[PDB]
Enzyme design. Structure first.
Site, PDB file in Angstrom:
ATOM      1  N   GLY A  33      33.133  58.603  33.957  1.00 22.04           N
ATOM      2  CA  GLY A  33      33.660  58.845  31.709  1.00 22.04           C
ATOM      3  C   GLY A  33      35.087  58.587  31.200  1.00 22.04           C
ATOM      4  N   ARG A  85      49.558  52.578  46.299  1.00 24.72           N
ATOM      5  CA  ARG A  85      48.709  53.892  47.297  1.00 24.72           C
ATOM      6  C   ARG A  85      49.073  54.697  48.225  1.00 24.72           C
ATOM      7  NH1 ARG A  85      43.473  50.103  48.721  1.00 24.72           N
ATOM      8  NH2 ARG A  85      41.763  50.516  46.613  1.00 24.72           N
ATOM      9  N   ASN A 107      37.664  43.028  48.791  1.00 30.42           N
ATOM     10  CA  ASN A 107      37.495  43.205  50.099  1.00 30.42           C
ATOM     11  C   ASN A 107      38.391  42.676  51.500  1.00 30.42           C
ATOM     12  OD1 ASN A 107      34.594  43.242  50.273  1.00 30.42           O
ATOM     13  ND2 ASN A 107      34.944  43.435  52.501  1.00 30.42           N
ATOM     14  N   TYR A 108      38.880  43.105  52.093  1.00 31.67           N
ATOM     15  CA  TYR A 108      38.981  42.040  52.660  1.00 31.67           C
ATOM     16  C   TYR A 108      39.630  41.115  54.146  1.00 31.67           C
ATOM     17  CZ  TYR A 108      43.409  44.768  51.936  1.00 31.67           C
ATOM     18  OH  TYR A 108      44.531  45.420  50.923  1.00 31.67           O
ATOM     19  N   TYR A 129      43.126  49.056  43.065  1.00 31.99           N
ATOM     20  CA  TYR A 129      42.941  47.279  43.543  1.00 31.99           C
ATOM     21  C   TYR A 129      42.846  46.904  42.423  1.00 31.99           C
ATOM     22  CZ  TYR A 129      41.403  45.195  47.317  1.00 31.99           C
ATOM     23  OH  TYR A 129      41.149  43.986  48.683  1.00 31.99           O
ATOM     24  N   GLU A 175      56.173  35.005  46.614  1.00 34.73           N
ATOM     25  CA  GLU A 175      57.041  34.270  46.094  1.00 34.73           C
ATOM     26  C   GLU A 175      55.607  33.022  46.268  1.00 34.73           C
ATOM     27  OE1 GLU A 175      59.942  31.150  46.847  1.00 34.73           O
ATOM     28  OE2 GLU A 175      60.486  31.488  44.727  1.00 34.73           O
ATOM     29  N   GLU A 190      48.683  48.816  47.869  1.00 32.10           N
ATOM     30  CA  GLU A 190      48.425  49.153  48.175  1.00 32.10           C
ATOM     31  C   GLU A 190      50.379  49.556  48.890  1.00 32.10           C
ATOM     32  OE1 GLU A 190      45.967  49.641  50.657  1.00 32.10           O
ATOM     33  OE2 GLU A 190      44.355  48.541  51.021  1.00 32.10           O
ATOM     34  N   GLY A 205      59.514  36.450  50.083  1.00 34.57           N
ATOM     35  CA  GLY A 205      58.780  35.102  50.117  1.00 34.57           C
ATOM     36  C   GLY A 205      57.381  34.715  50.314  1.00 34.57           C
TER      37      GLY A 205
END
Ligand SMILES: *[C@@H]1O[C@H](CO)[C@@H](O[C@@H]2O[C@H](CO)[C@@H](O[C@@H]3O[C@H](CO)[C@@H](O)[C@H](O)[C@@H]3O)[C@H](O)[C@H]2NC(C)=O)[C@H](O)[C@H]1NC(C)=O
Ligand SMILES: *[C@@H]1O[C@H](CO)[C@@H](O[C@@H]2O[C@H](CO)[C@@H](O)[C@H](O)[C@H]2NC(C)=O)[C@H](O)[C@H]1NC(C)=O
Ligand SMILES: *[C@@H]1O[C@H](CO)[C@@H](O[C@@H]2O[C@H](CO)[C@@H](O)[C@H](O)[C@H]2NC(C)=O)[C@H](O)[C@H]1NC(C)=O
Ligand SMILES: [Cl-]
Ligand SMILES: [Cl-]
Ligand SMILES: [Cl-]
Ligand SMILES: [Cl-]
Lengths: 126, 259, 256
Positions: free
Chosen positions: B46, B176, B118-119, B76, B141, B173, B138
């Site tokens: 909701g 999280r 997803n991975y 995500y 970037e 991540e 790095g």
């Protein structure tokens, strides 16, 4: 790892000057607070001088206050240390560093300084 | 038109990134629903649609600036916008598709990918595992410059997937896990490009099960153990929440607490 | 919906990494509950079912306190014969197991093997910390704090230093943080700006019990103060106990 190039150092008579240049080819040094650290053979890593990213603010320790001059060239991505009126207490291994811990420059050069240089010997002897 | 959180890699420091991940965590949860001292993300059931997504504007040293969209329900990444183009991950249900209609309305034209986020999808497209894609300032970037140029046709599809894997790990991540945040925090410190450890990989795979294991536990103790990994590829089992309180920063809403 | 909480059969580890044990494995009513080395079999005297009714059961019998005054021993007992609210227990996130009628707390006033468990006044001491888990060993990690430096202990002194791959720490079930190289020494703090040291865990005192929190701070439960690096200065080699504010000199992270 070492990501800053070091050019300078050597032997000097007490009361003389010396310059320590330090550049970064692949590192964007113009953004972070840059500083100089030294360490005598016996002990122990102490800080020397740092400079704000914009060159407006500089801090120096007691042993060098009034005699050393830190500077930078953000157009060339370089950092310098001018060591005028050298004393035998300055005999150490000098290394340039760049702090990526703090957005600003802290008093006493507080920070992590994870990007450092190779380091050269400075010797003030008569 | 959702909340906008901005972060740059030009001169990125440990504090600017710590303040960034903390600012992202602030706009993800209300902060109210907290179970075993670990916060809980809002419930998708909701949830009003103007409270469903938050935006993250990413720029770098180059003039290129890219904005990501995050699902508040699980932090995500669901898509991104670059200039006058918006690209979205292939949703997994009819409802998620409609919610995407409300993200980047003022675009030239929007595209939707054929693949999810997803991975196991992004690793196949990129041709690289998470264990070999390096992380750091790095890499972040380069991920931004690659994401912008895909709208102009500059970035190949494998690199686009590789750039997504970097953005999701270093932001989603990280929001999280304080663990994953600190692991990114040390890469920014000494300025290094490292791949995530088996510790970071396992925490990402277990985040869905860890949210379930914690919310419906008995006074903190898990019904069944969750297997984790150390920095070395060493497997151990976790039976209680106390050890995961410094590890987990956000959990996805599974169920409601008892009255 | 609403979260369905299960009834996980699990061990309960506490002081000195020892487990909750039913003395001699005998289950007659009133038999004492002790503190024994954790086993690696299926003997019912160390496996505890965290029941849905705030009871803790092993082999059918309930974990029951003999009385509601401090110092009475915890016993094994029939769940229907015992006093209705003497069998009830609450397991807190900070590691405390409390009987919510006496408000007293499950504790082991001695560290010796075979120590009879008792209920005591809650002081948040190591003698009052417990962990429900099937994990026998403590969790060995490296505690990283300010500037990404490691928490290192040498003799009694503990400071912070750049990480070198000792700096390993055993996070015990009783809430005590112990150096991995000497597992009967604890991260101790005497007063409740004071300095942390490495004394023996003998006292098992409030001040040797710690809790890793979600905000990143290591919190001493009894005092309410957290671990602090004096003036954010690692060169002082002093880790103190300061009130909470949340700056990097108070933030830590276990890196296992
Ligand atoms: C911690 O370890 C103990 C023993 O190593 C585990 O107790 C065992 O738990 C399992 C699963 O609950 C029990 O087996 C199951 O029994 C049910 C009976 O309804 C059956 O349907 C399943 O197919 C399965 O065989 C097992 O009997 C039990 N052993 C005992 C009580 O001696 C315990 O589950 C572990 N705790 C956690 C949280 O993993
Ligand atoms: C990230 O950047 C955007 C744009 O630079 C910020 O949005 C601006 O916020 C200021 C308030 O400081 C307003 O005065 C502007 O009108 C906003 N511009 C917009 C919405 O286009 C946004 O607030 C920033 N986010 C954070 C967390 O700092
Ligand atoms: C240990 O954890 C419990 C968690 O409930 C704390 O006891 C309760 O704390 C809340 C605040 O979150 C109070 O409103 C309640 O009155 C407390 N008692 C009960 C029975 O719920 C307890 O304070 C924690 N101890 C420490 C030192 O943090
Ligand atoms: Cl329900
Ligand atoms: Cl026994
Ligand atoms: Cl049992
Ligand atoms: Cl009962």
């Amino acid at each position: 790892q070492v990501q800053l190039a070091e050019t300078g150092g050597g032997l000097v008579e007490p009361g003389g000057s010396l310059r320590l240049s330090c550049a970064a080819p692949e590192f964007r040094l113009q953004y972070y607070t840059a500083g100089w650290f030294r360490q005598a053979p016996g002990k122990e890593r102490e800080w020397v001088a740092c400079i704000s990213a914009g060159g407006g603010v500089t801090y120096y320790t007691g042993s060098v206050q009034g005699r050393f001059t830190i500077s930078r060239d953000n157009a060339k991505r370089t950092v310098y240390l001018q060591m005028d009126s050298l004393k035998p207490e300055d005999t150490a291994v000098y290394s340039c560093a760049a702090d990526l811990e703090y957005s600003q420059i802290m008093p006493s050069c507080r920070g992590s300084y994870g990007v450092r240089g190779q380091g050269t010997q400075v010797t003030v002897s008569s | 038109q959702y909340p906008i959180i901005n972060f740059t890699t030009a001169g990125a420091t440990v504090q600017s990134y710590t303040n960034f991940i903390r600012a992202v965590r602030g706009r993800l949860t209300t902060g109210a629903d907290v179970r075993h001292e670990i916060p809980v993300l809002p419930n998708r059931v909701g949830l009003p649609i103007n409270q469903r997504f938050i935006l993250v504007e990413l720029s770098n040293h180059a003039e290129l600036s890219v904005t990501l969209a995050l699902d508040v329900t699980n932090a995500y990444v669901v898509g991104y916008r670059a200039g006058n183009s918006a690209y979205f991950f292939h949703p997994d249900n009819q409802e998620d598709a409609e919610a995407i209609t409300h993200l980047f309305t003022d675009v030239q034209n929007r595209y939707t990918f054929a693949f999810g986020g997803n991975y196991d999808r992004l690793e196949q497209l990129a041709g690289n595992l998470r264990e070999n894609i390096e992380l750091g300032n790095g890499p972040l970037e380069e991920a931004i410059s690659a994401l912008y140029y895909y709208s102009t046709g500059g970035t190949q599809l494998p690199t686009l997937a590789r750039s997504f894997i970097i953005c999701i790990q270093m932001i989603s991540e990280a929001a999280r896990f304080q663990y994953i945040e600190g692991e990114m925090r040390t890469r920014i410190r000494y300025n290094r490009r490292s791949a995530p450890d088996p510790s970071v990989i396992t925490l990402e795979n277990s985040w869905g099960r860890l949210s379930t294991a914690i919310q419906e536990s008995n006074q903190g103790a898990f019904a069944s153990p969750i297997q984790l990994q150390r920095r070395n590829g060493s497997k151990f089992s976790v039976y209680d929440v106390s050890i995961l309180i410094p590890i987990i920063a956000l959990m996805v809403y599974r169920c409601a607490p008892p009255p | 919906d609403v979260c369905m909480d299960p009834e996980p059969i699990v061990r309960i580890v506490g002081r000195n990494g020892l487990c909750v044990d039913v003395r001699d494995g005998r289950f007659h009513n009133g038999n004492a509950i002790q503190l024994w080395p954790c086993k690696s079999n299926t003997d019912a005297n160390q496996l505890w079912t965290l029941k849905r009714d705030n009871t803790i059961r092993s082999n059918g019998k309930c974990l029951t306190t003999y009385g509601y005054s401090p110092g009475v021993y915890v016993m094994i007992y029939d769940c229907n014969t015992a006093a209705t609210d003497a069998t009830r227990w609450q397991i807190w996130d900070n590691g405390t197991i409390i009987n919510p009628r006496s408000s007293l707390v499950l504790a082991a006033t001695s560290g010796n093997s075979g120590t009879t468990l008792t209920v005591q006044t809650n002081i948040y001491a190591v003698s009052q910390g417990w962990l429900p888990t099937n994990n026998t060993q403590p969790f060995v990690t490296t505690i990283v704090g300010l500037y990404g430096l490691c928490l290192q202990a040498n003799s009694g002194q503990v400071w912070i230093e750049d990480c070198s791959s000792e700096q390993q720490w055993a996070l015990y079930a009783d809430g005590s943080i112990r150096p991995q190289q000497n597992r009967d020494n604890c991260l101790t703090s005497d007063s409740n700006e004071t300095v942390v040291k490495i004394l023996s865990c003998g006292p098992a005192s409030s001040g040797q019990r710690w809790m890793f929190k979600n905000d990143g701070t290591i919190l001493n439960l009894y005092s309410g103060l957290v671990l602090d690096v004096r003036a954010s200065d690692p060169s002082l080699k002093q880790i103190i106990l300061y009130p909470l504010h949340g700056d990097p000199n108070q933030i830590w992270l276990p890196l296992f």
